[PDB]
């Protein structure tokens, strides 16, 4: 189990902690454009996934935006962000920042993602801050679950996993 804290005590997760080498669960989220997208689409490249609770929190910036730049520096990767937040809030955050290498997505709807990857925090109904990397087979190449929901992963980590495979 990933057992995340919420700044003073533990909080339960739905789902299980996934690992490297495992086949990713394969679900659907909405695009920020209000269409279904699933892991089956994402396997078209080595893909990084950046889970955050909602996009407005400022700490989300340090992920989605840095990921945009780092993905440009890699030159050949694919990256998405997923929130329990509105598709249009997510689209807008991208538009404000001029993001192009990353696209934001909304699990908001059916939580299928947050549930299956064990990042829906049961006790909050909120997505964890976590990251994953996925091979073109849809195998997990890296996974990390920030032990503290009030803190965020380092984007360098899934970059180092993805950059090893895009060569």
Curated annotation (Swiss-Prot):
GO molecular function, one term: thioredoxin peroxidase activity
S-S bridge residues: 60-94, 60-94
Reactions catalysed, as given in the entry: a hydroperoxide + [thioredoxin]-dithiol = an alcohol + [thioredoxin]-disulfide + H2O
Keyword annotations from UniProtKB, A to Z: Antioxidant, Disulfide bond, Oxidoreductase, Peroxidase, Redox-active center
Location of the Thioredoxin domain: 18-167
Leftover remarks: The active site is a conserved redox-active cysteine residue, the peroxidatic cysteine (C(P)), which makes the nucleophilic attack on the peroxide substrate. The peroxide oxidizes the C(P)-SH to cysteine sulfenic acid (C(P)-SOH), which then reacts with another cysteine residue, the resolving cysteine (C(R)), to form a disulfide bridge. The disulfide is subsequently reduced by an appropriate electron donor to complete the catalytic cycle. In this atypical 2-Cys peroxiredoxin, C(R) is present in the same subunit to form an intramolecular disulfide.
Role: Thiol-specific peroxidase that catalyzes the reduction of hydrogen peroxide and organic hydroperoxides to water and alcohols, respectively. Plays a role in cell protection against oxidative stress by detoxifying peroxides.
Entry protein name: Thiol peroxidase
Source organism phylogeny: Bacteria, Bacillati, Bacillota, Bacilli, Bacillales
Gene this protein is translated from: tpx
